[PDB]
Every structure is written in structure tokens, then in C-alpha cells.
Ligand SMILES: C[C@@H]1O[C@@H](O[C@H]2[C@H](O[C@H]3[C@H](O)[C@@H](O)[C@H](O)O[C@@H]3CO)O[C@H](CO)[C@H](O)[C@@H]2O)[C@@H](O)[C@H](O)[C@@H]1O
């Protein structure tokens with residue numbers, strides 16, 4: 001069962017929470033990771049299409065579209081490439097077309113574009129974004 005306002009009560013329920021913020025309250029990737037971990041969780045990992053649908057449904061209920069959200073995507077070693085901050089394997093992927101492109105060699109964190117494509121992009125970790133936690 002999920003904590004109240006993080007999802008449903010069944011044993012198979014996945015628990016995510018959107019944090020959409022104004023520009024003065026958006027966070028870097030590391031700040032967002034630390035925020036979610038302080039609650040006992042982590043930045044959201046998306047391990048399959050079921051989790052993607054869960055998050056998309058939350059976005060549709062939010063009324064806002066096109067927002068950028070930090071996910072738990074962070075580059076590891078050169079051989080690893082992208083990893084999930086929660087330690088789960090990066091099996092499922094939904095990178096946008098051409099991504100990750102490490103544009104100008106400075107993009108080591110992953111963001112979700114909150115539109116129907118639910119696509120991922122690598123971007124400067126120091127950008128201030130919205131974020132999504134999991135527990
Ligand atoms: C593809 C992109 O390349 C770099 O970002 C460029 C930026 O791309 C926008 C794109 O125009 C927009 O349609 C899409 O929704 O978001 C992208 C940003 O994530 O466009 C500006 C000009 O407006 C610059 O050309 C940027 O270089 C790269 O930084 C992004 O990570 C991404 O791979």
C-alpha cells in the first residue's frame with residue numbers, strides 16, 4: 001500500500017509523487033535526489049511501461065503539461081552509461097529520439113518531458129527542474 005497521496009492501497013500499487021514548483025523552488029538533480037532520499041525514497045525510476053503509465057496519469061491529473069521533471073537517471077562510469085539513482089537496472093528505456101546525446105559533453109542527468117510521449121532527455125545536472133519522487 002502507498003502512503004496517502006502517493007498512490008493506491010493494493011499490494012501491487014506503485015508510489016510516485018510529482019513535485020511541480022515555481023522557479024524559486026525548482027531544484028538541481030542532486031538537490032532533488034537528496035530531497036526524495038530524505039523522505040526515505042529516491043528520485044523516480046521507471047522500470048517498465050506500467051510505471052510510465054502511472055506517472056503519466058498523475059501528470060494528466062495535475063492539469064499542467066510540458067513540464068520538465070527530474071528522474072533518477074544519472075550517468076555512471078563510461079562503461080555503465082546511465083544508471084538509476086535507486087540502484088535498479090536500466091532495463092526499460094524511453095529516451096527521446098536521438099537521446100541521450102550528451103550535448104556539448106556536459107549532460108549527465110536525465111529529465112522527463114511531461115507530455116504524452118513521456119520521453120527522457122539527458123541535460124545539465126545543474127539545471128533547476130521539477131522532480132518526481134518514489135517510495
Ligand atoms: C535536442 C536537445 O539539444 C540540446 O538542446 C537544444 C534545445 O533543444 C530543445 C528543442 O529545441 C526543443 O524542441 C525540445 O523540446 O527541447 C530541447 C531542449 O531539451 O534548443 C536550444 C534552442 O532553443 C538549443 O539549440 C539547445 O542546444 C541539448 O542541450 C538537449 O539536451 C537536447 O538533447
Ligand SMILES: [Ca+2]
Pocket residue numbers: 099100101102103107121122123
Ligand atoms: Ca540531451
